[PDB]
Design a protein around this ligand. Sequence first.
Ligand SMILES: [Cl-]
Ligand SMILES: [Fe+3]
Ligand SMILES: [Fe+3]
Ligand SMILES: [O-]
Length: 477
Amino acid sequence: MINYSERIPNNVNLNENKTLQRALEQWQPSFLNWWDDMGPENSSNYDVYLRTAVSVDPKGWADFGYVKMHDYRWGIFLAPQEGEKKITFGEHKGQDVWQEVPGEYRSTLRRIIVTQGDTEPASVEQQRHLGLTAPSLYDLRNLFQVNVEEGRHLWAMVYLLHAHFGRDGREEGEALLERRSGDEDNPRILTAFNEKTPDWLSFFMFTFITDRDGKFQLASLAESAFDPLARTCKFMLTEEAHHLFVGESGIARVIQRTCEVMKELGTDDPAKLRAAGVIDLPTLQKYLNFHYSVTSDLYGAEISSNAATYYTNGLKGRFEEEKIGDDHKLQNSEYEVMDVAGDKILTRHVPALSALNERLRDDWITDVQAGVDRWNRIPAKFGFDFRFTLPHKGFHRKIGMFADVHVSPDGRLISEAEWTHQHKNWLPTESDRLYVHSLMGRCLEPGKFANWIAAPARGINNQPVNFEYVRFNWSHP
Ligand SMILES: [Cl-]
Ligand SMILES: [Fe+3]
Ligand SMILES: [Fe+3]
Ligand SMILES: [O-]
């Protein structure tokens, strides 16, 4: 490892700003208390082989070593500042990007930053029980790496709050530790982040699908005229890519194991696959349906004056804004969205500014579909017919125009009776979830993997797959 240096590694000259540094250090012990309370369960004395960034360059990014998570060096890292960067969209296109928050947008920027910050500890809270049933040291270590990274994402947003929003900033930093996933009176802001993540199959789906909402929200904010936010999100995207990998390869390894048992037993009978302790592909498809549809609601209403305002004011851009071939102002542009009118799902064009949530949702759908295309290479290579698919965008939605109807995965509007009698085929049943639960059992033997999942293609940081990625320090409970 590179030589220790700073208590809070950073590339923002934190030490030069005494007032700001003091505010973060006053908040730190509160963060550490939250981490001990709501962080990975019973993990206080584990030594975990973790990656820590200590500077933004490739070498400093990849500082691997054993560390207790309580002692993780959470830091603050902005993509390098560019000389003479201009705003790329909206009313202010062509002007210098902002280094400070414009008073007129203070409350909106604050809202955007806090809502993003809120999802980071929510994922840790949702996932805190999982290590008790980790299917391998490798997977246990990946879970912990995701967790400390989401912890750092909370630091990333709290830094912006303290640095740019004064006393309100600090009050937002405190409340971010007071809310709690699933709590009755102070729940987390967004509904999908108040859901349970009850097993490892849900965990891999969540990091494959819901961390991908993180990618598309962060990619939109990485375009912001408010440059400290833009540069914060650009760096965060490198960590988000790791989360997406954990999710995609996690499910890939599960599909691999189930295809192996299908080949061995020579059957696709789910009763027989389950007798052999694997997760049948159809059940995997239900979990895909579930996490996909719940995540889709995170993009918000298809039509929205708020999203239009964020774009025009230069706060939040479209995904890969600069690659888009239009005027980047959209006053006379359209975008095609669906609509529901009685017994018909139809299409219409609306003003582009009013449908930016739907555009972002569509970008995310395209990305998810690419990952699903990659999973499908597995049955294909085994010569099986099974293919995973994404359901219609209107299936199982609680936000927006499809909220008041039922749509089947194959895109029909369906009756209440048909939803009630058939959705057991489309979303995990209580019984499906009990079966998956029945398979969850810790496996901490080095190089060994629980029977429902295959080994990964390679280890971490060139270590053998049977490396002791976690040391439990059992003598010191
Ligand atoms: Cl404000
Ligand atoms: Fe995150
Ligand atoms: Fe993430
Ligand atoms: O993330």
